[PDB]
Amino acid sequence: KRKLAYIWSLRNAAADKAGQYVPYKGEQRYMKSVLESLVEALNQTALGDAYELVGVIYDDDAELPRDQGKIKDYGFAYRPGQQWFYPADLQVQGKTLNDLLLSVPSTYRRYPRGTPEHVAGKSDFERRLHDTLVELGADVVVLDGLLVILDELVRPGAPFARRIMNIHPGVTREDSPYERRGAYATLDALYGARGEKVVDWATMEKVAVEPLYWTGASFHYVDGEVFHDVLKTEISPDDTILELRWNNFNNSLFPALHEGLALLAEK
Ligand SMILES: Nc1nc(=O)c2cc(CNc3ccc(C(=O)N[C@H](CCC(=O)O)C(=O)O)cc3)ccc2[nH]1
DSSP: OOOEEEEOOHHHHHHTTTTEEEEETTEEEEEOOHHHHHHHHHHHSTHHHHOOEEEEEEOOOTTOHHHHHHTTTTOSSOOTTSOOSSOTTOBSSSSBGGGGEEEOOOGGGGSOTTSHHHHHHHHHHHHHHHHHHHHHTOSEEEESSOOSOOSSTTOTTOTTSTTEEEEESSBOOTTOTTBOOSTTHHHHHHHHHTTEEEEETTTTEEEEOOOOOEEEEEEEEOOOOEEEEEEEEEOOTTOOHHHHHHHIIIIIIHHHHHHHHHHHTTO
16 A cells, blocks of 8 residues: 555635535536545545545634634534535545544745745745655655645655645646646636737736637646546536536546556655
8 A cells, every 4th residue: 555645725625616516517526626536536446455544634713813714614624514525424445534634734834935034934845745745654645736835745766756646637748738727727718719818907808719628637846747638528608616616527527537556656
């Protein structure tokens, strides 16, 4: 079992409506999280034979009022009979899933961006990331929506540099026709379907473009080079953003992460 560690910013999961039902196609669909899908994968398939999920790290901090607002619907820990990112009772490999939550808070965000304290903290948070994976002996790490950008953890000769991966909601190949890199990838995919691309995001300035009707998800290295790729999400012009996210999560993302891990295991 290639020891697996998972990282995500809880605030990012709330935005995406993770663990919530969303109206889709005129009715509703449950917006399953990336972790829930992985938990199901580890439980019901041979992928489970290859890995043990060891820790589920999240970086949010309760002392950041913006971090608080962002998960108001969820809350930092599970409330009784209330909304949660997955069912509070979920089990992964005979381990209560909730029991694996870890916070390695990026508190450094309290200080202003670029300030010496902000930077000194960011390094220590990355330093704290490294340290506790090791506390978990993690053989492998997945990032799903972790908002901090790791520049130091993916250093030359650091113990997890090639063992650290991000699942991204779009293709990431340089010369790929459907490449949808960045934090705007889901929205770039929805607007590309309209044959329109956004020139300036603040004021929604746009431009005509050849329609693209497909998107996918990338399981790539973080230092990152693509290790496994899927592109199975047809995109429709009348599609909403909630529909596109779910479909890419269901058509291409869950598969890429699992196939990527499966392949990644004999390495
Ligand atoms: N169903 C439902 N629909 C939604 O749309 C929905 C939307 C949200 C987004 N919440 C946010 C709260 C605060 C910020 C922020 O950045 N604040 C900073 C710091 C000062 C402060 O902490 O206030 C600022 O003011 O500059 C951003 C987002 C949360 C639940 C939601 N639930």
